[PDB]
């Protein structure tokens, strides 16, 4: 914290600024009240959000449009934050990106197969995740046309390392394979960026944020093989990471999951994820776990972990947001708080 | 008799996506189309919801039960209306963001003659 | 039972509404891709109603597809699982209500 | 504002009792301290009183407040629509299509004779019907402004995509501006012309390759009869059963075949669909320039038909007795709103009431939660005494 405020002294306290924006349990509690979009729309114009609908004008207002632009003023304010940046910090900024990266990618080359037009497969891409040679994803079809022609400037270019194209050219079994070994060798890249370069107290509160990261996806993968793939546990290692808390005991066991209590037998060996498996929603599970991972990330001061903690968090609060904006609309109102608030 | 089997789907984007996680629709091995017609507001032609109703009630007799959202039937009335045969069944259900109105049904405008 | 299909579907429909925003990413498109078989298919049967006999339909789920291979969205990825799950049930109402229509 | 006036000013529509007196400097007749007193004379004051509407019922009257303060805003969006409209056709001015006087009449002046005005509109009619007309009038124009756009900027579309078939990037281009039978034919029994683009770096490899790419090629055909700054554009003619085989060879070599073909439907209609995308675009741009002009100033009166109707009919339900309200339209001179709307907040807000008179100076907006609101929708705190501001 002696060298944090040279090129990072406005980059936080901006940052720190975005955080008392998040809102609170009284400010969900607020929305939870709400009666129309409308409603909703006006007690979010109170908060920090603060007339962000206002080119809306009450009658094209969906709960879809509400998720899109209040999450779009997360990726600008994401995009100010990454302007002011420079050095390690950009660098940071950048691989934060790149996960986004491989989801528009694995997004836009689902778009080709099933012959879906390209200016419409294009706006359900996420906006953070640009690349200029994005949509010209659309030119081929198998893996290592689209490598070869597009995917070698990219940033994304050094995690094909394990996609062996065997000539077939893609169906939607396997472009989910590529996606989860994409993000497979980013979330080792990325943890080994964070331990080589990002100083040492956002270091170890990143490596936690990180390695969730890649033991949430270590289990959507093991628990999603069972439904909808048939693959060999030689061939499922490839796509576990080995970076998080989860690996070296955990995900052998994940591996050669073949039913759900192979999983669960697997992950009640583990200590701070036993109990996820056996009641309630387990995508809530995960997301309360990434709030408190996120929430004792603020706590720490000088540590450029409160970007990703930041960005999570707004993110969650989108999804809070869109989710009662959700109940209010179609008027459900049986799980309105279902919502994830540590703030 | 028994030789229909598939369920078409004439409905709004969302709507048809939903359906085809529960799985009803295909594209058939013996001509290469699909049961299902996705439309969108706004962004698609009056046009393809006529061409899509034929073919799915006079020019395939293996749809057993045609769904169509009450708005998007609409558009196509005529068709609708004309089309009075019950198979394939003829089933509008309330499209998305409306509940039932009965002003936009075929079958109904049929039963009020005579009881 | 228009109004209990209406319902049935529009209740499903918002929440495959919800799931596709909260991921982030539009799901329609691949969903239509990988399905190339009817996984809930209809039996027809004749059943006499006064003197003159009905067509009726009888739903059987046959085990061609589970789900579908396109989950893996990671953390999203939950959303999309569970919305099939709720779709599946929402379905199977509006069939054998169907079914009356004829 | 300083660039949305041109001749106009901006105005405060006011309406009080003819009870209703200054405290700002006491003493002073209503009428002489809007001359004298109202930032330092400058003020000018019209009159704006408009006669009785038939009124129904108590219940009724609520209901009436509520479609014209939807129903203004709608109208006010509306005129949104048509100003960026003229806009975007590229029509601006310095006095006009930013500003746009009434009829080609000031503005202040306009206002100042606007004592009910009668288009179709009764001053013995009953209220609603009127408010409902006014409405439905301004939709209607507002549908047709925005439809004859919609077909401009199609039309537009067209005009561009058929210039480069015309003189272009060769990806979309053959002539047809030209036609010859010894560059072009497909009308004879035996022989086709194949149109061939081949990069200028290729070029001269073209020349040499193209008699041998296919069997049967009519000798020293190959010529550029079209170029740009990246394709050439080439004729070869050749025997019909080759015509497969050479564009094939043609595209592995790197050299890009362009279709073309002699046939007349297709020559004559490219030529056309140049020709009649512009006659569309042209035709639609003089209809819609006049149409956005006619449908302002319409709009206009509309407005300003709602506003004044809007005055009166709050004042009648916040004041009660006495029937007949003395109302001004005072305009202020450009950037000097905010301070006369202190001086009018200050004199004549003690009727309202004691404690909902407070200083403002510029509007205050809220819309946080239910504990901040401000609106006609639904509000908790407001103006005291009965005032619209109509900013052009």
Request: charged share 20%; glycine share 8%.
């Given at each position: 914290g002696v060298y944090f405020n040279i090129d990072n002294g406005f980059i936080e306290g901006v940052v720190r600024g975005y955080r008392?924006?998040?809102?609170s349990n009284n400010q969900y509690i607020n929305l939870t009240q709400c009666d129309t979009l409308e409603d909703l729309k006006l007690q979010l114009?109170?908060?920090?959000?603060?007339?962000?609908?206002?080119?809306?004008?009450?009658?094209?207002?969906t709960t879809s449009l509400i998720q899109e632009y209040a999450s779009s003023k997360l990726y600008h304010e994401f995009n100010y934050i990454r302007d002011q940046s420079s050095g390690s910090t950009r660098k940071f900024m950048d691989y934060i990106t790149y996960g986004y990266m491989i989801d528009n990618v694995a997004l836009m080359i689902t778009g080709t197969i099933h012959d879906r037009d390209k200016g419409e497969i294009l706006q359900r891409?996420?906006?953070?995740?640009?690349?200029?040679?994005?949509?010209?994803?659309?030119?081929?079809?198998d893996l290592e046309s689209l490598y070869e022609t597009?995917?070698?400037?990219?940033?994304?270019?050094?995690?094909?390392?394990?996609?062996?194209?065997?000539?077939?050219?893609?169906?939607?079994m396997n472009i989910e394979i590529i996606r989860n070994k994409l993000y497979k060798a980013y979330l080792e890249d990325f943890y080994n960026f964070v331990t080589e370069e990002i100083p040492e107290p956002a270091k170890e509160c990143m490596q936690t944020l990180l390695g969730f990261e890649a033991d949430r996806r270590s289990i959507n993968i093991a628990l999603n093989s069972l439904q909808s793939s048939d693959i060999d546990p030689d061939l499922k290692?490839?796509?576990?990471?080995?970076?998080?808390?989860?690996?070296?005991?955990?995900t052998f066991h994940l591996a050669q999951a073949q039913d759900f209590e192979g999983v669960r037998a697997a992950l009640?060996?583990?200590?701070?994820?036993?109990?996820?498996?056996?009641?309630?929603?387990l995508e809530d599970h995960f997301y309360q776990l990434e709030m408190e991972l996120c929430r004792d990330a603020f706590?720490?001061?000088?540590?450029?972990?409160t970007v990703w903690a930041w960005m999570k968090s707004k993110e969650q609060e989108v999804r809070n947001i869109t989710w009662i904006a959700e109940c209010i609309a179609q008027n459900q109102?049986?799980?309105?708080?279902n919502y994830i608030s540590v703030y | 008799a028994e030789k229909r089997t598939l369920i078409a789907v004439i409905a709004d984007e969302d709507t048809t996506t939903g359906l085809l996680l529960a799985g009803i629709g295909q594209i058939t091995?013996?001509?290469?189309?699909?049961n299902f017609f996705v439309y969108q507001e706004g962004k698609t032609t009056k046009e393809e919801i006529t061409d899509k109703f034929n073919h799915f009630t006079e020019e395939r007799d293996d749809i057993a039960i045609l769904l169509i959202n009450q708005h998007i039937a609409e558009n196509i009335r005529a068709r609708v209306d004309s089309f009075?045969?019950?198979?394939p069944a003829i089933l509008e259900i309330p499209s998305k963001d409306?509940?039932?109105?009965?002003?936009?049904?075929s079958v109904l405008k049929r039963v009020r003659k005579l009881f | 039972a228009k109004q209990k299909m209406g319902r049935v579907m529009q209740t499903a429909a918002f929440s495959l509404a919800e799931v596709s925003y909260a991921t982030g990413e539009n799901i329609g498109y691949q969903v239509q891709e990988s399905?190339?078989?009817?996984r809930f298919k209809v039996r027809a049967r004749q059943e006499n109603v006064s003197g003159v006999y009905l067509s009726q339909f009888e739903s059987y789920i046959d085990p061609?597809?589970?789900?579908?291979?396109?989950?893996?969205?990671?953390?999203?990825?939950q959303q999309v699982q569970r919305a099939k799950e709720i779709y599946s049930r929402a379905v199977e109402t509006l069939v054998e209500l169907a079914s009356l229509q004829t | 504002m300083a660039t949305a006036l041109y001749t106009a000013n901006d105005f405060i529509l006011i309406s009080l009792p003819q009870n209703a007196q200054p405290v700002?400097?006491?003493?002073?007749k209503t009428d002489s301290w809007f001359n004298?007193?109202?930032?330092?004379?400058?003020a000018f004051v019209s009159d704006f009183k408009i006669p009785e509407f038939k009124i129904g019922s108590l219940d009724t009257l609520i209901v009436e407040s509520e479609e014209l303060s939807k129903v203004d805003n709608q109208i006010g969006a509306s005129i949104g629509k048509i100003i960026e409209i003229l806009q975007g056709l590229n029509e601006t001015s310095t006095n006009a299509?930013?500003?746009?006087?009434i009829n080609n009449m000031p503005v202040p002046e306009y206002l100042e004779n606007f004592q009910w005005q009668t288009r179709k509109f009764?001053?013995?009619?009953?209220?609603k019907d009127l408010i409902t007309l006014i409405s439905n009038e301004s939709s209607q124009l507002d549908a047709d402004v925005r439809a004859t756009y919609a077909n401009y900027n199609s039309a537009k579309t067209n005009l561009a995509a058929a210039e480069r078939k015309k003189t272009?990037?060769?990806?979309v281009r053959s002539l047809h501006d030209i036609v010859k039978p010894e560059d072009f034919?497909?009308?004879?029994?035996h022989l086709t012309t194949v149109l061939v683009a081949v990069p200028k770096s290729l070029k001269s490899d073209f020349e040499k390759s193209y008699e041998t790419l296919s069997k049967n090629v009519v000798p020293?055909?190959?010529?550029?009869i079209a170029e740009d700054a990246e394709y050439v554009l080439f004729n070869v003619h050749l025997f019909k059963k080759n015509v497969q085989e050479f564009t094939t060879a043609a595209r592995e070599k790197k050299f890009i075949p362009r279709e073309f073909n002699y046939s007349e439907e297709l020559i004559d209609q490219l030529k056309k669909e140049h020709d009649s995308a512009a006659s569309l675009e042209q035709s639609l741009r003089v209809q819609l320039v006049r149409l956005a002009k006619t449908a302002y100033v319409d709009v206009f009166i509309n407005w300003f038909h709602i506003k004044a109707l809007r005055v009166y009919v709050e004042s009648v339900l916040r004041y009660?007795?006495?029937?007949h309200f003395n109302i001004k339209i005072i305009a202020v001179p450009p950037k000097n709103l905010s301070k006369c709307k202190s001086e009018l907040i200050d004199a004549f807000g003690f009727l309202g009431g004691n404690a909902f008179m407070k200083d403002k100076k510029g509007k205050i907006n809220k819309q946080d939660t239910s504990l901040h609101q401000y609106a006609s929708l639904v509000?908790?705190?407001?103006?005291?005494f009965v005032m619209y501001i109509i900013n052009l």
């Open positions: 008392n924006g998040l809102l114009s109170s908060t920090d959000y603060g007339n962000f609908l206002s080119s809306v004008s009450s009658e094209s207002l891409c996420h906006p953070l995740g640009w690349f200029d040679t994005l949509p010209t994803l659309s030119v081929a079809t597009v995917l070698v400037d990219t940033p994304l270019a050094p995690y094909f390392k394990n996609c062996f194209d065997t000539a077939e050219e893609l169906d939607d290692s490839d796509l576990l990471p080995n970076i998080g808390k989860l690996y070296p005991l955990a009640a060996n583990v200590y701070e994820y036993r109990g996820f498996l056996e009641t309630g929603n706590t720490q001061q000088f540590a450029i972990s109102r049986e799980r309105i708080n | 091995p013996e001509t290469q189309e699909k009075t045969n019950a198979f409306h509940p039932y109105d009965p002003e936009k049904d | 399905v190339s078989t009817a061609e597809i589970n789900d579908f291979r396109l989950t893996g969205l990671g953390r999203g990825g | 700002t400097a006491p003493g002073s004298e007193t109202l930032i330092g004379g400058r299509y930013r500003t746009l006087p009764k001053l013995d009619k009953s209220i272009g990037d060769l990806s034919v497909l009308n004879s029994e020293a055909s190959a010529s550029v009660g007795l006495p029937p509000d908790t705190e407001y103006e005291p």
